[PDB]
Amino acid sequence: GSLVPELNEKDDDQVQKALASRENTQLMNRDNIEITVRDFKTLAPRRWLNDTIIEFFMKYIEKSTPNTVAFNSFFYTNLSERGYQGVRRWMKRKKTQIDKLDKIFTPINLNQSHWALGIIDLKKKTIGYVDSLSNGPNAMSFAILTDLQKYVMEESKHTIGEDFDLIHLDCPQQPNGYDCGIYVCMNTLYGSADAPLDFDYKDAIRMRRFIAHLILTDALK
């Protein structure tokens, strides 16, 4: 069917009211992710998501999926610009260790203009790069895959990662220029559930409202 639900009328109206609030108030503050109205409005129709919404969705997937870490997008920025040393201390702050995980998700911001996703699957021994506006395996995608493979090898103290398969994963492609962050969230949701990537652009429209509902209903308890 679809892993992105449709909101009832009451829940949808709550989202519409919050998108119209007159001033930049705090809408949610839980699990070290604070969301203001300015952040929330990036979920309005046709708008580019910002890092706050991407981080909130990563937290939601961590909250509902076992043995999973989903970093915010600043993890890949640091790893790519400043090597493993730039993210060496981050897993410790997740209160867990790489050898206890099934998956690590790493949302990637590309040049302040596009969002994509890395999926480290420790159980399947694979590192995947999934992009909703891609023509296919290319060289930038390779630097990302080798960076994630490097992370696994260093964080595990060279116990795991050297034999992982690096793959440019296929996924439903966005039909517009603004849904990339929503496709990142759908790819994290479906990848966390180990579900076939068969969502589409109508799911992307519903996804914006679903994520907005999760925020207003304080889904991270």
Partner: protein
Amino acid sequence: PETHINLKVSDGSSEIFFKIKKTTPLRRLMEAFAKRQGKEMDSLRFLYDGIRIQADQTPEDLDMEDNDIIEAHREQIGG
């Protein structure tokens, strides 16, 4: 090195050293850093070991240790 802590805030080019009480909110520190870059607070994310600091959280709240670093990152957007 009991009640007070030394912290550095860096954006990768500009770094400012601060010494605050462990029970003092980081708000003032964060606003001072932003003002020096002439940048708005809502455009900057202040992270500690990957955790997005909320102004008002203290060093004690985040388990900081002397000479820890706070990274100031630019908001990210994408289509």
